Amino acid sequence: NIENGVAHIRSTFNNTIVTITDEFGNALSWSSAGALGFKGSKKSTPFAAQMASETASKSAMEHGLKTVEVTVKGPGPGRESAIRALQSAGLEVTAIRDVTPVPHNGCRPPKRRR
Amino acid sequence: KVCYFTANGITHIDYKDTELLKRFISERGKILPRRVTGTSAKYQRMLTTAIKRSRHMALLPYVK
Amino acid sequence: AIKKYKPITNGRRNMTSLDFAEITKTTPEKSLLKPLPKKAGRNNQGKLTVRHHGGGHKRQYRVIDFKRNKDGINAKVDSIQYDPNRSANIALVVYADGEKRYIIAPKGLEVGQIVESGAEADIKVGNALPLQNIPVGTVVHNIELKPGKGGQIARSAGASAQVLGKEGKYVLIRLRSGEVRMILSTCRATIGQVGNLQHELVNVGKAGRSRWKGIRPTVRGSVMNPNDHPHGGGEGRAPIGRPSPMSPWGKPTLGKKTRRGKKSSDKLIVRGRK
Amino acid sequence: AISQERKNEIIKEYRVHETDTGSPEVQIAVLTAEINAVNEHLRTHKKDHHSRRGLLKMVGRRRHLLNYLRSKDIQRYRELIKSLGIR
Amino acid sequence: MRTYEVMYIVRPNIEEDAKKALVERFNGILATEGAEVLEAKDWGKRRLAYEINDFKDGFYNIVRVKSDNNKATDEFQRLAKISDDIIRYMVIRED
RNA sequence: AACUUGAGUGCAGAAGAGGAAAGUGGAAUUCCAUGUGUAGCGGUGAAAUGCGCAGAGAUAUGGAGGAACACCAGUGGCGAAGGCGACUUUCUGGUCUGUAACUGACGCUGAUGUGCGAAAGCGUGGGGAUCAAACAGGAUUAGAUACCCUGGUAGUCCACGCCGUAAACGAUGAGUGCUAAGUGUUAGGGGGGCCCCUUAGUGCUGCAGCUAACGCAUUAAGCACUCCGCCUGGGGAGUA
């Protein structure tokens, strides 16, 4: 394409899955922190998210991407480093919307640890 | 602070009055706590009912 | 409802019967009754083809309107009656200008309710109208499969299909088994579930009461001789000594799918059950 | 339960004198209509246990008012017991 | 005695000739069985706060009725459910 | 025989997730079908089982089904208690305020009795998304039939019945009256947005007084009167 390809970032307490798709929800490329050789307790780190984002960002430029919408889904440590890893590659981040699903109840949350 | 339902004298909040309700729904349609809006306990209840009626009739967003 | 007999006899301990309270007239009509001479499993040659079928109480056939096609003329329910040839009850209906005919009794159809066939009909229990005009989500019984043939699908006590959606010339319908399928839109149904919803909860009790509906005893194959059945023979009681339970005529019986392939209905079954 | 207009005709029917609302002939009669109304409600909503509890309090109030009336004068007790259908 | 306000939404793609055919008939049941409809207002094609059956807009009609039978409003909701033109309705007892 | 203050009724008002039935919604989870998509996903303290390469995870659209109702939401409200939170309608219970129109003690408590009664459990018939006793593994340990992880059955949901137990607790029976205050909040009333007075709830400090102490203190565990239930060292034993 030319531009307007949204990027979905899944930052959790584990690896950060970063995927770059077009505006109509068609995946171009993707790169998680686990696909970069990162071991556990490395996967959920700001450093790993930095390479995780730009690794998929370079694959986007081959299709000619000049506009990204950052849709972040998850409460993970590697969120902000991921977004600054997209501007550092020159992807012209327009919007920062959080899409972490919030149930209006209606499901039994899995039991917590002990 | 002042209630706006006692100050101006409104004794019946109408769910068709979307403009009046949009002052208490914040940025998501989320009902604002009465501490933030300063409406009394008596009117926080009939305002919540009006808001929920408007949401069902698509006069106010559930989320935004 | 179900009446539980008191254990006055052993052969009658756990027996149960239908209270027959929804029925209102206990006698048929001379002009909508034709003869049914029991055949008992025998064919055009005279040989037993289906088994476990024999003597039973006589029964008169009651002509039913499965093809509800009197379109426009209204009809009054005169009496809900008992039918011996089916699980559900039948209801006499008198049409607004003189003719009378039987139908299948829906769940809460009451005496004196009005029913209408047609295409401009309302969506109420009993009225029959084509599947192009039946809203998505309605319980329907007596569903046709072919335009004008007559209801075939869903006709036994407690049978109900749900119109679930559309395609082009076919409507999607979830039949009682759990199968979703498609039926041509120009075919008729009838709004509502069929009555006698408690027919499935009855207990028979007596051997003879099962031997009054025309059932005959069925012998377990594990006691016939080797020349009578695959499971037969053995000195003593024996397990099934084969890789699979078998049928009298030599064909696997616990799992083998016996639906002819290459049928002209395969393009119409979406998901299946049973 | 019973509407206010419905209650008034019961008041007028069994009032001892004019402007009487508290005599144990109108109170008993009003409760009888009220009791039958909740009884009719519970024919459909059988498991309305919370409403049924208020019915038992009304029955007790009428029973105590009937005991008081009988202990005061038996004539008015006999007239009230037959008009209302109370056994 | 009892006063009801009925608001229903009609799909925004209805044919204009059919709109008066539907609004007429549906205020028709609201005047049956002792119902004496007082107001019958049109609110116009407003924007819905969210998509309803893949619709972004819709016609709003508000009808106020008064009757001590309540079966007029029940008959409305029974037919409003069946009709594919009405996509949302709500009956409020107003006192 | 007489009387209204007790108790009830009448009239004018008030608030409420009080209960039952039937409908209508939005978010989310799961599964299914496709489009894009490529080598991981997931999880831990580290793992691994596990799901993937037969295309998983992710992403977009659509569909099916079940369950619960974010924000409002609070020492907030209602109910005798258990308990009751999406919205609408229909039936329906209780409570509070004011008035003083009516009856003139019609009241309290209450053995036996008769009903209601969280979860779990049972029967019948449905339903089954999520979470899951038990069960399977994978780990940690010296061992781990446990905490951790991966799944997973009954159950969790509905309709009828049955069960009748909970740290069912304010660990505080019900009714009535009296006895310093201060300051809140909920629902009303009357006077001169503010102030004063007042009724009923719900809170926090705090006098007298009580207590072994902790503490209670006008919502007593103080001062009095009526009625019921219960206790008489610990085990054996809530067992015969």
From Swiss-Prot, chain A:
One of its GO terms (cellular component) is ribosome. The keyword Ribonucleoprotein applies. One of its GO terms (molecular function) is rRNA binding. Signal peptide: none annotated. One of its GO terms (biological process) is translation. SUPFAM superfamilies: Translational machinery components. The keyword Lipid metabolism does not apply. Keywords: Ribonucleoprotein, Ribosomal protein, RNA-binding, rRNA-binding. PANTHER family: 40S RIBOSOMAL PROTEIN S14/30S RIBOSOMAL PROTEIN S11. Part of the 30S ribosomal subunit. Interacts with proteins S7 and S18. Binds to IF-3. Located on the platform of the 30S subunit, it bridges several disparate RNA helices of the 16S rRNA. Forms part of the Shine-Dalgarno cleft in the 70S ribosome. Belongs to the universal ribosomal protein uS11 family. This is Small ribosomal subunit protein uS11. It comes from Staphylococcus aureus (strain MW2).
Swiss-Prot record, chain B:
GO terms for cellular component: cytosolic small ribosomal subunit. The keyword Transport does not apply. Keywords: Ribonucleoprotein, Ribosomal protein, RNA-binding, rRNA-binding. GO terms for molecular function: small ribosomal subunit rRNA binding; structural constituent of ribosome. One of its GO terms (biological process) is translation. It comes from the Bacteria. Belongs to the bacterial ribosomal protein bS18 family. Part of the 30S ribosomal subunit. Forms a tight heterodimer with protein bS6. Binds as a heterodimer with protein bS6 to the central domain of the 16S rRNA, where it helps stabilize the platform of the 30S subunit. This is Small ribosomal subunit protein bS18. It comes from Staphylococcus aureus (strain MW2). The gene is rpsR.
Curated annotation (Swiss-Prot), chain D:
One of the primary rRNA binding proteins, it binds directly to 16S rRNA where it helps nucleate assembly of the platform of the 30S subunit by binding and bridging several RNA helices of the 16S rRNA. Pfam families: Ribosomal_S15. The keyword Hydrolase does not apply. It comes from Staphylococcus aureus (strain MW2). HAMAP family: Ribosomal_uS15_B. CDD domains: Ribosomal_S15p_S13e. The keyword Transmembrane helix does not apply. Keywords: Ribonucleoprotein, Ribosomal protein, RNA-binding, rRNA-binding. GO terms for molecular function: rRNA binding; structural constituent of ribosome. This is Small ribosomal subunit protein uS15. PROSITE patterns: RIBOSOMAL_S15 (PS00362). Belongs to the universal ribosomal protein uS15 family. One of its GO terms (biological process) is translation. GO terms for cellular component: cytosolic small ribosomal subunit.
Swiss-Prot record, chain E:
SUPFAM superfamilies: Ribosomal protein S6 (SSF54995). It comes from the Bacteria. Gene3D superfamilies: 3.30.70.60. One of its GO terms (molecular function) is small ribosomal subunit rRNA binding. GO terms for biological process: translation. GO terms for cellular component: cytoplasm; ribonucleoprotein complex; ribosome. The keyword ATP-binding does not apply. Keywords: Ribonucleoprotein, Ribosomal protein, RNA-binding, rRNA-binding. Pfam families: Ribosomal_S6 (PF01250). The keyword Aminoacyl-tRNA synthetase does not apply. Disulfide bonds: none annotated. Binds together with bS18 to 16S ribosomal RNA. Belongs to the bacterial ribosomal protein bS6 family. This is Small ribosomal subunit protein bS6. It comes from Staphylococcus aureus (strain MW2).
